[PDB]
RNA sequence: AUUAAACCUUGUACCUUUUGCAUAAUGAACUAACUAGAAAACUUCUAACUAAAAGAAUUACAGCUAGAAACCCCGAAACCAAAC
RNA sequence: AACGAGCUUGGUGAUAGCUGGUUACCCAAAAAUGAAUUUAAGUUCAAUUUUAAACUUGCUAAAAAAACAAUCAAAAAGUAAGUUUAGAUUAUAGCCAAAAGAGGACAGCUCUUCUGGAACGGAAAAAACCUUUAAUAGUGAAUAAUUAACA
RNA sequence: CUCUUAUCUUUAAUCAGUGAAAUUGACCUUUCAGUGAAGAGGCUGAAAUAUAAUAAUAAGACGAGAAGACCCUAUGGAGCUUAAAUUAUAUAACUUAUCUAUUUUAUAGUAUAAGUUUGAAAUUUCGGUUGGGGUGACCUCGGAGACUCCGAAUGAUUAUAACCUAGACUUACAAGUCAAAGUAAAAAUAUCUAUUGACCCAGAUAUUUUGAUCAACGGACCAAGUUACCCUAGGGAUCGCAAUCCUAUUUAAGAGUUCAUAUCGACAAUAGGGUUUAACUCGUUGGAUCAGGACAUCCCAAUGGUGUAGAAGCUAUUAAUGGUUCGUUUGCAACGAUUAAAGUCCUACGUGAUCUG
């Protein structure tokens, strides 16, 4: 253009709109993004990503499935740096669903947990920690570091109540409580419980891990050796009594 | 450089003296000091209430021992007591209005009758037109005032005091129309006019820097005073009935604003419109009022009231003209 | 302030479209046209604004009006302009919901 | 144009600049060399794979990855530090 | 060897809404109005303009009838544009003629509104008035304004 | 100086040697009238006109050089002044402490810290609109008139005015307007007139609310003068009405008038000049030298008319031919003596690359 200040190419910053009060500071702040930082974040599942994944051979419905065989499969894609603590089930597809598997996700919903059921299946909810949710999406790196396997913290107080209830199929919930929530939901969305003990695979379903394992078959405080394709097991007492607790 | 109160003194000093020359002294300190407050009883329903609460505080109605429909409680003579801030009564009505107790004297001198029709020009929330409403018991009356803030106060006021049934009859009319305009609309409708012409009002003058006459931007104003004063005073005349009474009010101790005014208006009344006035005498008026009021006998028309250090009431003159046709 | 008729005669009227703001009674309310505080006309109903003057009768209650409208003689009748909108759409309309 | 270099006909230097006008106002004696537009948030275009793309951490309700495609020069009066 | 506060080096490529400058061809489209601003030698937004994409009515005109020569606009017709979405600036001082208001219900003068123009031809003068749809070769041709007036 | 001259040196000019500077778009570089921006060697219309040198003049080339002058602008500076804003272990002071002496609490001091009081200083600033200046002022919103006027940072009345949600007005943005339905209190709109202030940041409470003559009113949390001692970057220039009062011409209501004997003039009309009537200081040029032109003629010359006897005049026309003084007071205005007359004007004070106040 012409001569003068953009021509200069010392025209003011952006936001700048001549001198009366820009547009963006002269609006009262509101605390939509506060905490955004600290809040949870769950990769949601649908039923319908769950059937097709089946159907397609990239999840194995024999075995237990968690995050490490949803990751695995690429069902999931999951960012534990991005406050990611793991994987919702959704009620999306739940009609289409006709399989029968062993699912654990941090997160279920009442009528995710209805086409589960209604299939004959076992559906879970367990809380992994950020120090824990990295390496059980991530196991073989941690394996290289050589550090022994960490223990699973329990849930902060605000989850205490969520993961301890019966209805919501919480891993510390009350083993007892199980049935009769069941056999409400069953009712509600009629259909009639199905017996898992009398299935062949009830072993297989009713496995789970326990509440300070990352892993379903590998203890706190193991060291995996992949280049001598060996586990090493602490002797010491004075471990074992951290890792046991 | 100088305030519009350094001009306003200086103006007293090279005129006001000359003419009152050794009642000057006084007359100077007096403006200075604080002026003296008298409580207007609001009647009504606190008729009673107020005048038995004013007799605790010791003030005595003035209007009282002159006689021995306005009674205005006073402090003693040489007293210096402040009168309580004035309060709401239990129908709503303030109790009585705080007020200079010669600014009555125009109301108690203009004779009001029952059943007349009367006349405010220029009145504004001098407070004459509050104390005016509770004379006038049998009385239709009529205000006017230049501007309209000036004027939307008055409103406020009569709301106050008068009583909405009072207000709602004709009786009590508020307009905001020129003066001498005024008075070729309604000619010899009103039996009593009471005029207090816009002056230079040097106690406020002199106190107050707001709205002073002695600005130097409104120095054309100021000049023009005299004129502004005769054409309102005029007005008032041609407003008037035949046998009317017209009481003609000016704050200022100026000769100039006082006396020359009044006789200059009756004279331009003869000439152009061919009428006559007679001069009215308040002596006996003074006589009466010489132990609340002190006037001083050189005006040849009117009764000035100076204020005193003693009785520091003034400054209000007032004179009252009959028309004779 | 930039007060006018907003709509036309001929347009289409939506419900809430405000037909036009006067500072004073211009123009004075029709069928189906809300008046608002602020003296502004609204629609109420789909319809086409068509003005039309019609013989206006106040209300008994309020005195000026009553007294303005005995002032006048018997043969003369006043008049001011209305703004009307005629309803465009049918409110409702029958369907068979279920063959029981 | 012309048979003919000049005569005859036509024609108000250049740049910047003022309004989109100069008979103005700036700058240039002439030659050689040197002497001033640079970045990928968003967009467009071109491909690879595709509910997935990326050679670790990223993004995704057709996306994702890579490529190409962009934003000058000269000049104050001054201010501070430390020597002289 | 020019002190309202020495000189040298460094900070330092100080900073400059200001002045000056900013290097090949070709084709195409293309405007100094509103708002805010320590603002009026600047910038930002609206409006305008532009490149692409989407799909469908757009411009002139527009009878009756309103609200009063306009604000609005239906069938038509003459004709090809208009709306939406994505990206992006510069621009924000006009110049002159001719119309109409409005300032002192004046002319003028200062504004405001509408219209037009930016020759190589014409008008002693000649960017602004009048004739003139772009630009190309020809030793073709018909023409426009005008080349003063004979009252 | 009237009034200038003569001789000599220097410089100049010529022969010989040596050899700068500012400046320079290109130039084959004319006159007059016209046009134009106080403007023309170059454009328009006439005219003039062999080519080159040497030496002179300074009219033009808005001639060339300088850190000179002038008015205005910059959210450019720097010096000074403080009644500017913010600080201020320069100093001095005192107070409580720390701390060492001492006496039973006490008065002493203080390698320190925390305050209070002065300020030697440091830092930073000079809003906008008013044809310049001091004084007035005005800067936002809305009502009325077509710029002239009125108001406001609302008060009174209010048996107290919910929530939620279609569609729209207005509008750069931000702000500001109206509202069906649904739902809820109660037994539908508070009442006029009209009324503004963002974000940040501080206050309040048991979850709802309050903070601006931020009035320069889109608002810097908080900054005045002054410069002729100045500086830089640039831009510039170098008509209306009224209200009386005077007058002039035409009116003349009137009176008038009286042997080289008379008119004036009410009232009007019309041209001028003032006054009242509407905020509070001013903006190149004499002289010397040489002059070019205009005529609207001052003198010379040629004439008409005359209330021209002769002699002085007055009025008028034609004519631009040559001429058109010397001083004193000295800031131009007077004056004194003369002359046939001591013209009026234009030529960017006519003319400072000719000189000077
Ligand atoms: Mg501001
Ligand atoms: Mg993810
Ligand atoms: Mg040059
Ligand atoms: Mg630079
Ligand atoms: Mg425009
Ligand atoms: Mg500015
Ligand atoms: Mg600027
Ligand atoms: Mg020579
Ligand atoms: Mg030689
Ligand atoms: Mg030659
Ligand atoms: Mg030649
Ligand atoms: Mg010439
Ligand atoms: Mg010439
Ligand atoms: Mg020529
Ligand atoms: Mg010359
Ligand atoms: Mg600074
Ligand atoms: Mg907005
Ligand atoms: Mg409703
Ligand atoms: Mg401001
Ligand atoms: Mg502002
Ligand atoms: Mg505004
Ligand atoms: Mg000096
Ligand atoms: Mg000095
Ligand atoms: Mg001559
Ligand atoms: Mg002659
Ligand atoms: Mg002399
Ligand atoms: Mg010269």
Not at chain 1, 186 to 197: H, N
């Amino acid at each position: 253009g012409h001569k003068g200040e953009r021509q200069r190419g010392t025209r003011p910053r952006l936001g700048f709109e001549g001198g009366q009060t820009p547009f963006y500071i002269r609006i009262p702040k509101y605390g939509f993004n506060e905490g955004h930082s600290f809040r949870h974040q769950y990769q949601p599942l649908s039923l319908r990503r769950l059937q097709y994944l089946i159907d397609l051979g990239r999840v194995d419905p024999t075995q237990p499935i968690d995050l490490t065989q949803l990751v695995n499969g690429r069902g999931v894609t999951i960012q534990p740096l991005k406050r990611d603590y793991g994987v919702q089930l959704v009620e999306e597809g739940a009609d289409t669903f006709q399989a029968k598997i062993n699912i654990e996700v941090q997160l279920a919903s009442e009528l995710a947990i209805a086409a589960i059921e209604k299939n004959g299946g076992v559906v879970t909810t367990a809380f992994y920690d950020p120090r824990s949710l990295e390496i059980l999406c991530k196991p073989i790196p941690f394996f290289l570091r050589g550090q022994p396997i960490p223990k699973r913290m329990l849930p902060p107080e605000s989850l205490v109540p969520y993961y301890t209830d019966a209805k919501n199929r919480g891993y510390l919930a009350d083993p007892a409580k199980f049935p009769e929530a069941r056999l409400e939901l069953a009712m509600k969305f009629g259909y009639v419980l199905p017996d898992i003990t009398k299935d062949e695979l009830f072993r297989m379903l009713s496995a789970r891990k326990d509440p300070r394992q990352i892993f379903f078959g590998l203890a706190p405080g193991w060291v995996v050796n992949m280049a001598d394709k060996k586990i090493l097991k602490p002797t010491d007492e004075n471990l074992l009594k951290y890792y046991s607790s | 450089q100088f305030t519009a109160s350094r001009l306003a003194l200086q103006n007293f000093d090279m005129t006001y003296s000359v003419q009152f020359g050794d009642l000057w002294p006084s007359i100077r300190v007096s403006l200075l000091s604080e002026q003296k407050y008298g409580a207007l009883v609001n009647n009504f329903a606190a008729w009673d209430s107020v005048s038995a609460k004013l007799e605790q505080l010791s003030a005595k109605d003035f209007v009282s021992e002159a006689i021995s429909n306005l009674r205005c409680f006073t402090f003693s003579r040489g007293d210096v007591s402040r009168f309580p801030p004035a309060r709401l009564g239990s129908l709503g009505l303030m109790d009585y209005y705080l007020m200079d107790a010669a600014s009555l004297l125009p109301v108690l001198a203009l004779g009001l009758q029952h059943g007349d029709t009367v006349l405010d020009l220029c009145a504004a929330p001098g407070g004459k037109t509050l104390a005016l409403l509770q004379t006038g018991c049998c009385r239709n009356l009529a205000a006017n005032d230049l501007s309209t803030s000036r004027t939307g106060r008055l409103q406020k006021v009569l709301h106050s005091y008068v009583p909405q049934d009072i207000r709602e009859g004709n009786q009590v009319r508020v307009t905001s129309w020129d003066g001498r305009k005024w008075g070729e609309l309604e000619g010899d409708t009103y039996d009593r006019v009471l005029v207090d012409v816009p002056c230079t009002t040097d106690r406020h003058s002199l106190h107050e820097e707001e709205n002073n006459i002695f600005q130097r931007s409104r120095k054309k104003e100021r000049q023009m005073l005299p004129m502004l004063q005769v054409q309102l005073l005029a007005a008032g005349l041609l407003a008037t009935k035949p046998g009317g009474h017209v009481v003609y009010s000016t704050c200022s101790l100026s000769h100039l604003q006082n006396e020359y005014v009044v006789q200059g208006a009756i004279e331009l009344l003869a000439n152009q419109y061919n009428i006559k006035v007679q001069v009215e005498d308040l002596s006996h008026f003074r006589k009466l009022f010489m132990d609340t009021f002190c006037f001083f006998p050189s005006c040849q028309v009117g009764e000035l009231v100076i204020p005193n250090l003693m009785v520091n009431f003034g400054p209000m003159y007032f004179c009252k003209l009959h028309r004779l046709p | 302030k930039h007060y006018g008729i907003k709509k036309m005669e001929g347009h289409y009227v939506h419900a809430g479209n405000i037909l036009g703001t006067q500072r004073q009674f211009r123009w004075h309310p029709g069928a189906h046209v809300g008046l608002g505080r602020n003296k502004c006309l609204y629609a109420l109903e789909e319809g086409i604004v068509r003005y039309t003057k019609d013989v206006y009768v106040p209300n008994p209650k309020n005195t000026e009006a009553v007294d303005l409208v005995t002032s006048l003689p018997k043969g003369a009748v006043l008049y001011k302009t209305f703004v009307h909108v005629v309803p465009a759409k049918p409110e409702g309309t029958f369907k068979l919901v279920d063959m029981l």
